[PDB]
Write a protein that binds this DNA or RNA. Structure first.
Lengths: 165, 244, 334, 366, 177
DNA sequence: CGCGGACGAAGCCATACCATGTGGGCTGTCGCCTGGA
DNA sequence: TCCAGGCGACAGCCCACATGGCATTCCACTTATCACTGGCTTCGTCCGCG
């Protein structure tokens, strides 16, 4: 399962440097949130749910605000770290995680970009690599990864909370 | 001079004091057995003088004791009313009473590291490397370890048993050294048993009493191998420098 | 001069040879329980099949009476009345040197074909083979005969993975019902076990051919032996659990120094939830590789396999089928 | 001279033969649990069907005294004379004091300890031999501990009376090793080709009449069931079967009816509430002249699913039969029928049109 | 080692179910099901922070926590009234005292002890809820740690429940002289 | 009349309540094209 | 021939919910079945065979 993680990592670094470096391909990959993907991320793909897991998160990567654009825990830890540190509401991000963890494959790509972009607007660190292997893993086993996200979120939230006192 | 046999494999059974159906084995090898194996590796038919095998020394380090199992063994059963094992008079028994049932015991899953020290040890080693008869461990049906002769040539092989020989995995406490392993030398002796072989001929088997003294020695914990697949590996790399 | 044979054979849910209490015989190797089939079992099962063919290859094909050609024919003793005995040598199966006596002490006397009782001299067929006595030890119904052994070392067959016995609750149902039904015949419990057994055996033609002679007769005995070793399966409770099978891997090797077994390769038991044949094959390969590169030797190796997925390098040249492998190896043996 | 038969049969959500506690019997094969149907259950269904057609009634029982006494009471003997008579027939066959019996529960005839296996005409003839010595039996009952008076030779020759089911399946009788006939059909256990876990059904037998205040079920419990695609196999040693039967036409009819009952029949274990009757989705008969062979090792590596298992099982049996055929070459006969026309199974021989056609052409070729 | 976490969970869940209904309702709907089943996506909030660091251990925690929240109000009202036994001892104390069927409990105990890791989780919940229906005092920490050790060998946790059950039965009968 | 095969005759038998702790090893990647070194 | 650069122009920001609730009773069965065969000793005689 790591064979997808390494490719996803090469893609995230090359795309990060490419979006801060060249604005043309940045705005061209951002328009999808798709020919640009066929000509940019295609060499980083070895089931089409994996390929869409790559270019979809690539577009989410190119659509982030500059503040968070110029700068291993999964997305659950990322949301817990955002909630405790950067003042996000618990009763709202919890409800959003359940909302995302309950849907099917085509649902996570519809409700995920808004939340990822929103948490990114606070300079939160998303290990994009494992996020790509997570959305790829969403096809093999959905409820297993969703489980990892929710239980991981609550786990690290209460662990850091009790750790703070 | 000398060499280090590695007594291992699926099953071992060195018998003694059993001249009937019920066969039993010892919790450690007996010189009669392995001297029978050398004799089988050199081509001496039963009845020949075994004086050559005198003057030999066998200290054996037990790696793991191994657990004892009883092997049920019926012979001659199910065969028709006119085929079993004859009687001395020649008159067979009734088929319902024809088969004879022997329950021969055997020692299973144990490994010993013997240290042979003798004048003929070099020819014995070169005989085990190419024998004139399938060498076995205790009884014919038991197949020996591939690495039957761990090290072919070593001066003072006893010191090799006390240090730098791989041991199977066992519980070892944290940063603990001085792990005990029992080895038998031959006052303060443990037992006397019929081991010295005088004649193997099937017409008159003849043995004698022999002393045995088990000394529990201490060995540094750097020899215990890992959980699995590590022991056989370490012993392979151990037999690798044999040429050197 | 040592023909070693290894074979992986997976037996289904059955009970080949039970213990003193119903359970199948088990060894505890590498710390774990492992059901096993005794060597005697797989011996009386091979032998009982060898004679069934060798001792029948054949009274209607090669025949024993078909002699004289070297003691009764090209000798002068009635080149035409050759049936002289022949018919006088009847009122198991031998090779050729011990047959010289068959056509030898079959002449002289008178004879009395003019219309035949001296057999205490020919009866010694087993005393000097009876090849089925040089391959395997003495018979089982005749007093010893100078050659109690041997030659064909046979090893016990233990599983390559820890297998625990499983209780098969069974019951007998009587067909004559009273006015209180369900009174079955007799409730009871029979233990069975399944698994993939590893098997091994050695044939020492070196100290073998001597006891016999005609390297061709010896060649036939070892070839039919190998075929019987793969072919046969014991006859324990087969009529109730049909477990007839063929080895999923067959490796015959001809070594000129000493026989060697691959049993320690299966020391660390194999955990499962998957199949065991492929893992066992590639693991036997690995062990053959390290052992081959640690004890280098110029030996012959060949193997057949019922799975074309893996490529077994250390096992030699992959022949196409069992009888081809046996033929090329027995030929390569001399 | 060995008629081998293989068959892939998928049984739905059911419980054919439970264990001593309800659960279905399971094997641990290739590392994974696999529900199985014991061999003796199918063998029983088979015999009852074969003997059903060939109305031989190869009764296996213990109460031979009870039925012999019944036969003697039908033929004029008094109740006590019949009981003592039958006890004489059974008590005159062992070494001394006859075969071993069990503690008599009621005043009813006791049940022997061993299981007999005879046809009904055999029991009838036993009652005849008992009737030939009316006076003698009555004279023995007058004593306190009677002995054998019957001509053990002919009754022992009557117990040896075979039958089609006796010929195929064989008989055992420890106290009479002279009547032991050896079976000619090797029947194997049927294990699934894919790991299947058991599943609990929760049932509540509710009482129909209401209670004054509350209403609860009459009984709640849970039974274990399982579904899956079973593999089944059996061998018929023609040689020994023709040896037992003696003739070759009776033998041929017995093997043909055996095969047809082997495919047709299905056990009667909790079928009244599951309706698990089915037919094998694949039937492969091969006639081998050297040794019988099973395809069990092909199904060692369990099959993962979420898809079907019939096609995978069919093509995998094909693959194993093909490579196995090219590794153990032999001049044998191969034929197969199939209830799925998607793939074409080459290695299984010549595809006959139907099960009974396949069986007819294969038994004929043997 | 695990027993300590077991006592933590049993502590806050034993006071949690009685002191607030939200968690009792989020846990009740998780009895006898996988830790990833969507229906139990609401129980992580309470149980996920206590699992240590194989799936048998988490299965144990979630499954028994749900069992503790799905017991009837009678069993909780008695559970909140204010060496140590397994649940086998609980079965014997149930048959000997509360009049259950001996010949049945024995075959249900050997039926459950004879199964695989998944059979103990499917057969267990109704059995333990029946025991709490009869209000027998069952210990939860031991029950979970037992299920945790139920995954390495199906012999070291079954044999001790069966032998402990029979042992305590004949001690309760011999003590009734 | 001569005789095979099978069984049976015993010696034996055996008044000063409690427990168990274990595990670890496998795999391959790209952006392409022009310019300059 | 291989290493290195390049490849028109493509936006910035800021905000993200408060509360309240999470049920109870009941039911948990019966009976019948649980095998034998033996691995001792010699000789004489007895019933059946040729």
């Amino acid at each position: 399962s790591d064979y997808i993680l390494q490719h996803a990592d090469a893609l995230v670094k090359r795309v990060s440097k490419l979006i801060v470096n060249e604005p043309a391909a940045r705005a061209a990959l951002r328009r999808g949130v798709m020919l640009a993907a066929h000509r940019v991320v295609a060499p980083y793909v070895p089931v089409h749910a994996v390929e869409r897991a790559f270019y979809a998160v690539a577009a989410i990567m190119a659509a982030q605000p500059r503040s968070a654009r110029d700068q291993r825990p999964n997305l659950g830890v990322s949301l817990a770290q955002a909630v405790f540190d950067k003042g996000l509401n618990a009763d709202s991000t919890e409800q959003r995680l359940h909302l995302i963890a309950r849907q099917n494959l085509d649902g996570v790509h519809r409700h995920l970009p808004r939340l990822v972009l929103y948490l990114r607007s606070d300079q939160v660190h998303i290990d994009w690599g494992i996020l790509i292997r997570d959305l790829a893993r969403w096809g093999h086993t959905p409820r297993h990864v969703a489980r990892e996200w929710v239980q991981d979120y609550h786990r690290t939230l209460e662990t850091l909370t009790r750790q703070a006192e | 001079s000398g060499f280090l046999l590695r007594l291992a494999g699926p099953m071992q059974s060195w018998g003694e004091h059993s001249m009937f159906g019920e066969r039993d084995t010892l919790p450690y090898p007996s010189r009669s057995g392995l001297i029978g194996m050398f004799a089988a590796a050199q081509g001496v038919r039963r009845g020949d003088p075994l004086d050559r095998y005198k003057e030999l020394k066998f200290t054996v380090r037990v790696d793991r004791p191994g657990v004892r199992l009883v092997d049920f063994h019926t012979i001659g059963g199910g065969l028709p009313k006119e085929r079993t094992v004859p009687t001395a008079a020649g008159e067979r028994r009734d088929p319902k009473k024809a088969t004879i049932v022997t329950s021969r015991s055997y020692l299973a899953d144990a490994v010993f590291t013997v240290a042979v020290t003798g004048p003929e040890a070099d020819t014995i080693a070169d005989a085990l490397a190419a024998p004139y008869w399938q060498p076995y461990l205790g009884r014919r049906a038991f197949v020996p370890d591939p690495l039957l002769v761990l090290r072919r040539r070593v001066a003072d092989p006893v010191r090799e048993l006390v240090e730098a020989v791989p041991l199977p995995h066992r519980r070892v406490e944290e940063d603990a050294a001085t792990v005990l392993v029992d080895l038998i030398y031959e006052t303060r002796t443990l037992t006397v048993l019929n081991d010295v072989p005088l004649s193997f001929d099937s017409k008159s088997r003849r043995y004698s009493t022999r002393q045995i003294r088990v000394v529990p020695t201490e060995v540094p914990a750097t020899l215990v191998a890992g959980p699995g697949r590590d022991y056989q590996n370490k012993l392979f790399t151990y037999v690798k420098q044999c040429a050197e | 001069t040592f023909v070693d044979i290894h074979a992986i054979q997976t037996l289904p849910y059955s009970n080949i040879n039970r213990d003193d209490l119903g359970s199948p015989k088990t060894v505890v190797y590498g710390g774990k329980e492992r059901t096993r089939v005794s060597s005697q079992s797989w011996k009386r099962a091979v032998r009982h099949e060898v004679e069934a063919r060798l001792g029948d290859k054949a009274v209607r094909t090669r025949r024993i009476i078909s002699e004289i050609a070297k003691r009764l024919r090209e000798r002068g003793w009635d080149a035409d009345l050759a049936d002289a005995g022949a018919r006088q040598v009847v009122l198991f199966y031998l090779p050729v040197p011990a047959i010289d006596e068959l056509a030898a002490i079959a002449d002289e006397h008178r004879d009395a074909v003019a219309k035949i009782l001296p057999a205490d001299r020919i009866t010694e067929v087993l005393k000097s083979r009876n090849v089925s006595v040089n391959l395997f030890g003495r018979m089982l119904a005749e007093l010893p005969s100078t050659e109690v052994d041997g030659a064909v070392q046979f090893a016990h067959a233990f599983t390559v993975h820890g297998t625990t016995v499983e209780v098969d609750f069974f019951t007998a149902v009587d067909d004559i019902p009273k006015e209180n039904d369900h009174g079955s015949g007799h409730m009871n419990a029979g233990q069975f076990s399944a698994g993939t057994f590893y098997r091994y055996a050695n044939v020492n033609l070196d100290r073998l051919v001597e006891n016999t002679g005609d390297a061709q007769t010896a060649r036939t005995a070892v070839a039919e032996f190998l075929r019987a070793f793969l072919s046969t399966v014991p006859s324990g409770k087969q009529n109730a659990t049909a477990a007839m099978t063929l080895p999923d891997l067959v490796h015959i090797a001809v070594r000129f120094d000493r026989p060697i077994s691959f049993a320690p390769a299966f020391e660390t038991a194999l955990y499962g939830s998957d199949g065991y044949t492929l893992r066992a094959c590639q693991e036997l390969n690995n062990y053959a590789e390290r052992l081959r590169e640690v004890w280098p030797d110029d030996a012959i190796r060949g193997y057949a396999t019922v799975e074309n997925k893996t490529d077994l390098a250390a096992l030699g040249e992959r022949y196409d089928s069992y009888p081809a492998l046996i033929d090329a190896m027995v030929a390569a043996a001399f």
